[model samples]
Target: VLSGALCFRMKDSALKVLYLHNNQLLAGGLHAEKVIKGEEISVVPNRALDASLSPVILGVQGGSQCLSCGTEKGPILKLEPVNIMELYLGAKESKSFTFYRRDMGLTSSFESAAYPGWFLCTSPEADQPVRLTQIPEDPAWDAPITDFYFQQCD
Candidate 1:
């Protein structure tokens, strides 16, 4: 059995998942995609920041950035909460699967990479508000994850 709830909001033109819940026998995950100014761009996982998971964000090397927000280079906007789950059929039979976000956000600016903006519920305890940052040409694989980027002018 499984159940949950979700609530959302917009802060500084960025999408934010205010609430979410899950009650199931197996584990699950979420995904978030961002479209900036009517452009369908980057799609990232909620835990893209975590190194223990995937090394890249939605296949992009440095992740997407917002060049129009006049901010330092970093993760401009990315998907979140890529949930994975496991289920039992019976007689020692089990299976695993993953789930992501279908809904997305429309933002003014993201980061230097000039990608779209969106967030997921994976970082439920993340207290800092997503902000614009700079883009690094060669980011270290072990470096700590940061939020998206945004520039003042495109």
Candidate 2:
């Protein structure tokens, strides 16, 4: 459960569309996909700027559904809670839909709030669905598939 309910305003422009360096858009529903145009990603900041664990509500930009790591304790991403507004307004209490946004130089990584070790990642090949994975241990993995760039639609 969330400890404090932080405030969100329209000016934040928290909604964005994520893509890889190859320009593949992250979309689809709970079964995320990589394509030219798909679903929008929304990250609602849930804490102050001073903390490392700056939790966020990882859900669709205009939809109520959100990504979660269900009770199975695996790396699967589940869309749940039904209403994202409730989570943003503090009306819904859950940590499963929350994620920790890790911003790097030119990319960002979203770690599962419920599963600490897992991170949301896109597939290496095109037209593949985006999913969660533990840190890639293979040195041959050229790019960090977990890091991505986000753009806010005008």
Candidate 3:
């Protein structure tokens, strides 16, 4: 389980998240909307009793088909694929993004071994994408966030 603003972008873009409520995944708030302090949940892996598969199944805290990917193809990221649930409320069922970081060394920015970039990122609005922008001389890029609990279970 991971926490810390699980962001979604192209190594650049506004920092936003997918909210699960009303049985739907919605990227609420505008481009510059501040996170609701720390009440958000994005995805959860498929923990089967015996054997589990890839596709870090993207679903709400509860259980059910909650991925749309906005298309029929559905979710199929690199590490794991997202189960296509007709009940998915997200703007798109197939959303490829990296979760944020909390206890990272030197900083709380998004951490990834493969790419040095792809840190914390945001988005425009529901269904919209984002672009990465790192200002070497700007503090806003790596400043401490509102919260960093990295809560695993509610």
Candidate 4:
């Protein structure tokens, strides 16, 4: 139930691609110029779900690359050379682009597999870049920005 192509929606926002700007992965805006290509993400989990360092490649839909965070405190970006079939069926592995997908009952969180405790998060303000952080907070909304609601996009 936690596998397949999916659309990730922020608790109070619509699903869209993580835009690459100035080498940073920012949240895509919800507007006409921002829409393209279904905006789905291909989620490929590791063969062994409960194993240590188990991670998934959240690949950009229809592209070979997947989401990645390079350093302990680096900005999020896309890593290339990912073939979803290789990771899903052939057991390919990628430490840079993979994330530990944690389901927190009603919502989910994506923490960097390369840097444990660092999570993928969005800012409370609009047009802000998505980032990696140990603390995921939205001061205005008083919500955890790391949590997401996912839905299958067929």
TM-score of each: 0.18, 0.67, 0.31, 0.65
Point out where model 1 deviates above 4 Å.
Answer: 1-125, 141-154
Candidate 4, which segments miss by more than 4 Å at Cα?
1-25, 28-38, 48-54, 71-76, 90-92, 136-144
For candidate 3, write residues 1-154 as lDDT tens digits. 3432232221122334434333434444554235422224444432331121122333334333333223223322132233323213335323333232444433234322123333333333343322232324555544323222233443
Candidate 4: tens digits of C-alpha lDDT, residues 1-154: 4344444433313344455444345655566224422345567666645466446667654435567776545545555566565556654455766678777766667888777788877765545666777863435464437766655554
Q: For residue 122, what is the lDDT in candidate 3?
A: 37
Best by lDDT: 4
**TM-score leader:** 2
TM-score (C-alpha, index-matched) for candidate 2: 0.67
TM-score rank, highest first? 2, 4, 3, 1
Quote the positional error of residue 153 for candidate 4 in Å. 1.3
lDDT digits (tens) for residues 7-74 of candidate 1 = 11222222332221221011111232232121222222223233333212121111122112222343
TM-score of 1: 0.18
Estimate the TM-score for candidate 4. Answer: 0.65
Query: How many clashes (backbone N, Cα, C below 3 Å) per candidate?
Result: 40, 0, 21, 0
Superposed on all Cα atoms, model 1 deviates from the true structure by an RMSD in Å of 17.2
